[PDB]
Design a binder for this molecule. Sequence first.
Ligand code: HCS
Ligand code: FE
Length: 186
Amino acid sequence: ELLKPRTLADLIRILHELFAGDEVNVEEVQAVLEAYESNPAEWALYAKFDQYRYTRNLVDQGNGKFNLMILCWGEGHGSSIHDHTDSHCFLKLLQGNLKETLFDWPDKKSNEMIKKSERTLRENQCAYINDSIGLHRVENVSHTEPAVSLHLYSPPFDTCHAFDQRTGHKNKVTMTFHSKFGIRTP
Ligand SMILES: N[C@@H](CCS)C(=O)O
Ligand SMILES: [Fe+3]
């Protein structure tokens, strides 16, 4: 029975219930993530920015079933065009706005990756992506407002691919956590 999360802590407890089994009800997970109303005090501990690029801050390891993390995007910070390593990926805005640009999987032949579509994800909205849907880029295009987002991936992954927009060529990337459970992890 899906109830509204009263706090981030409550959200985490609910997510543990929803991932207790071997499968994922994506619509239920998205609904509960959307239903949590971002409260900056509850996640300030995790909102550790870097001047030069976005940061990934681990919040919960989901008893192995998922990683829950907070990403902090300075003005002008964005991601590569990337995949999600055969995992479910949910993205909820906690602060600010992010531009999501969708791309198709490239063909073998080298070619410009043309954007399929784009949308602006606004505060408290939750997006969902997986490799069967396509690839995406996520960017804070604001000149004046930092953005903060809450990401859930299941199963957890720490490697993915970045795609060259000019050719479609992919390279393996390993991502690191800027912090874990509020502690900077250089
Ligand atoms: N998956 C990316 C963030 C955009 S969804 C990352 O883990 O850094
Ligand atoms: Fe992504």
